Amino acid sequence: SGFRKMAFPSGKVEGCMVQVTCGTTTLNGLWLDDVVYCPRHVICTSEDMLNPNYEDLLIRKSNHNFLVQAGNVQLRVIGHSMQNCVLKLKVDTANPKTPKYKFVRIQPGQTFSVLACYNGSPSGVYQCAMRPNFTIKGSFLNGSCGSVGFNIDYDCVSFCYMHHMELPTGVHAGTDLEGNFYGPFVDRQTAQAAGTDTTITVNVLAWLYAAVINGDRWFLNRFTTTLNDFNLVAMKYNYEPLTQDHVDILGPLSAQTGIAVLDMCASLKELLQNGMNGRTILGSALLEDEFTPFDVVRQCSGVTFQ
Amino acid sequence: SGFRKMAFPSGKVEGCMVQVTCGTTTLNGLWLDDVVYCPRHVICTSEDMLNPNYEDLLIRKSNHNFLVQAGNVQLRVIGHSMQNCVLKLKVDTANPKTPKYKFVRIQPGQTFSVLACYNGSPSGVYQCAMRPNFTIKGSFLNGSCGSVGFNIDYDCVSFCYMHHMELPTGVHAGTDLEGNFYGPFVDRQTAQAAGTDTTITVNVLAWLYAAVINGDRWFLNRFTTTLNDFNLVAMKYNYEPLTQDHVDILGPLSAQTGIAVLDMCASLKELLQNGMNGRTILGSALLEDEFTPFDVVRQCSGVTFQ
Ligand SMILES: *[C@H](O)[C@H](C[C@@H]1CCNC1=O)NC(=O)[C@H](CC(C)C)NC(=O)OCc1ccccc1
Numbered sequence: 028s029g030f031r032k033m034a035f036p037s038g039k040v041e042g043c044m045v046q047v048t049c050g051t052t053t054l055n056g057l058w059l060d061d062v063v064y065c066p067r068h069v070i071c072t073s074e075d076m077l078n079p080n081y082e083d084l085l086i087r088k089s090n091h092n093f094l095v096q097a098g099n100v101q102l103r104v105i106g107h108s109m110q111n112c113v114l115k116l117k118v119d120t121a122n123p124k125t126p127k128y129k130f131v132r133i134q135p136g137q138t139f140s141v142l143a144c145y146n147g148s149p150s151g152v153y154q155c156a157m158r159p160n161f162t163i164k165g166s167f168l169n170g171s172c173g174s175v176g177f178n179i180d181y182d183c184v185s186f187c188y189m190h191h192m193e194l195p196t197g198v199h200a201g202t203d204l205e206g207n208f209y210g211p212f213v214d215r216q217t218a219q220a221a222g223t224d225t226t227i228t229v230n231v232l233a234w235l236y237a238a239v240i241n242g243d244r245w246f247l248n249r250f251t252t253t254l255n256d257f258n259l260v261a262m263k264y265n266y267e268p269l270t271q272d273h274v275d276i277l278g279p280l281s282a283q284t285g286i287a288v289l290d291m292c293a294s295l296k297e298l299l300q301n302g303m304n305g306r307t308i309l310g311s312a313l314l315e316d317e318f319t320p321f322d323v324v325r326q327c328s329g330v331t332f333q
Numbered sequence: 334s335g336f337r338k339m340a341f342p343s344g345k346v347e348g349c350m351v352q353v354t355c356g357t358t359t360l361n362g363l364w365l366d367d368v369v370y371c372p373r374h375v376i377c378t379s380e381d382m383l384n385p386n387y388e389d390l391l392i393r394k395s396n397h398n399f400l401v402q403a404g405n406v407q408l409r410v411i412g413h414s415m416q417n418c419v420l421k422l423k424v425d426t427a428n429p430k431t432p433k434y435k436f437v438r439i440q441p442g443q444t445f446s447v448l449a450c451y452n453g454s455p456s457g458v459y460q461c462a463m464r465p466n467f468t469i470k471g472s473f474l475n476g477s478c479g480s481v482g483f484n485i486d487y488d489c490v491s492f493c494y495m496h497h498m499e500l501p502t503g504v505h506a507g508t509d510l511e512g513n514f515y516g517p518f519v520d521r522q523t524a525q526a527a528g529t530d531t532t533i534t535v536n537v538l539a540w541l542y543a544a545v546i547n548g549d550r551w552f553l554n555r556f557t558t559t560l561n562d563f564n565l566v567a568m569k570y571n572y573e574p575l576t577q578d579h580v581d582i583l584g585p586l587s588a589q590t591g592i593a594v595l596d597m598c599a600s601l602k603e604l605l606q607n608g609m610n611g612r613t614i615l616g617s618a619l620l621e622d623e624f625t626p627f628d629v630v631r632q633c634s635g636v637t638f639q
């Protein structure tokens with residue numbers, strides 16, 4: 028029993044974190060096979076970050092301006108290119124520890140583990156969600172750039188995130204590992220808006236299901252509702268519209284629990300209109316939306332490796 | 334910026350998790366050098382767990398009744414003993430991946446990372462605190478026993494917890510790695526009370542300091558207080574008495590922030606007497622107590638490896 032914000036075991040991605048230095052800036056880089064991925068703003072100086080002409084800065088750079096080291100071992104750089112906002116550094120040595128891996132562009136509402144690094148060395152793992160507005164509520168100090176987000180499936184690391192910047196609101200933004208930002212962001216030290224952040228309704232329901240599974244059942248109603256009437260309630264409260272594949276995705280949880288999805292939505296509507304009245308659900312006084320249905324099932328089922 | 338429940342990188346302890354089987358029961362075990370530590374109730378059968386005579390069950394056991402495997406590799410057992418509630422299985426092979434390690438008995442209020450395992454394979458990491466009442470609010474399904482809790486310092490793994498059982502309240506109990514339970518617990522399938530759980534006051538303050546550091550400053554008062562008068566407030570609300578080495582431990586946070594500790598206590602007294610009025614602190618509507626002062630400093634400072 029019990030439900031926790033659980034990150035993936037980080038051992039596979041640990042052996043992939045390197046230090047990438049270019050002049051005074053040091054960032055983290057991801058060493059897979061014989062290429063090192065890192066945020067391209069490693070090539071920026073003190074001033075360049077207001078509005079960098081990245082191709083023009085990269086031209087001033089040669090292979091030997093890129094100090095990359097894995098722990099103590101310095102790797103020789105035999106090639107560099109820029110793919111979108113990511114620098115790809117070809118190195119002579121294949122990482123002896125590259126795991127089976129995929130690059131994937133995750134979708135909003137999906138979660139992933141972040142291995143927060145500084146100076147190529149790991150300092151912590153936590154779980155977070157790609158918000159609907161394509162930001163993450165992370166914990167990133169200076170030098171954390173190039174820290175990566177990932178999922179594990181069997182022995183397969185699925186890298187989906189590389190950290191680039193902090194916004195004015197204090198949330199975080201970053202790219203997929205092909206260097207394309209999630210969201211409308213650009214890697215400049217400029218004021219950039221994220222949109223309104225909506226709540227991931229299907230995740231909240233999955234967390235209500237985990238709550239029922241774990242004994243928290245006070246919020247269970249005697250009511251029901253309809254997709255459309257709940258969806259009018261969702262829009263009042265900046266909740267993403269619940270759709271028919273959402274109820275289908277909750278199917279396993281609905282069956283394992285014997286609570287129809289729309290009975291759960293009607294429970295959620297009451298929580299949204301009457302608050303929690305100072306009660307708690309799974310040790311929280313807020314509605315939690317960083318648990319996907321798969322997170323719940325994996326945790327309430329104990330799926331290993333992954 | 335940002336503050337998250339961060340676990341330690343789990344790579345070092347991953348390479349130490351094995352499967353230990355004895356008849357029908359399978360648990361996780363910790364393979365360090367040529368010994369495998371695992372909960373002694375691996376030797377229990379269906380019925381034995383109501384009130385096991387553990388020495389009498391262990392006598393029926395020989396070295397070859399202990400199937401331990403690391404991934405696919407089965408290790409030969411060359412010796413077994415029982416130290417308190419832990420079985421020590423001597424194996425012929427030293428783990429080629431044992432990290433620098435210590436066994437430590439952590440104190441209440443301290444935190445640690447848990448690597449939740451099933452069948453000797455890791456499935457997730459999360460952070461939790463040894464409650465004042467010596468339980469943990471974990472996430473542990475069947476087969477999770479032998480999962481371990483740990484801290485990292487430089488390259489040094491400090492193992493402090495091994496999971497044994499779930500209580501009626503759904504919290505979790507376990508031993509240090511010398512097999513002595515934290516708390517008044519015994520490894521029987523019996524109804525066992527933990528005490529009232531008090532809130533770790535010094536941790537709540539450290540989290541208020543992290544909140545100020547991260548921009549959340551609405552709760553800051555114009556009041557002050559005294560250790561004794563706050564401590565009368567703490568006792569009303571099941572908060573552990575704040576002591577003089579507690580304010581001294583908060584010293585670095587008090588200095589880095591310019592908020593006297595007793596000004597913070599007076600802010601905490603107001604939160605305790607007037608609630609949060611539907612506001613949030615660091616994305617939470619509850620007062621959080623699973624962050625020690627060192628957790629805050631490490632996170633607000635970015636300390637690596639550890
Ligand atoms: C990469 O190490 C860094 C991560 C920031 C630093 C503090 N917290 C973070 O998430 N990213 C940047 O410094 C980025 C540089 C651009 C050229 C992409 N600028 C940025 O994020 O500005 C916001 C900021 C806030 C607080 C301190 C420094 C920068």
Ligand SMILES: *[C@H](O)[C@H](C[C@@H]1CCNC1=O)NC(=O)[C@H](CC(C)C)NC(=O)OCc1ccccc1
Nearest residue numbers: 028374382473474475476477478497498499520
């Ligand atoms: C070890 O794998 C297991 C962990 C329990 C199982 C479910 N959640 C847990 O934390 N520990 C035990 O099964 C323990 C056996 C005693 C001989 C130590 N008994 C126990 O914890 O009883 C409570 C329980 C609750 C729900 C399912 C099974 C047992």
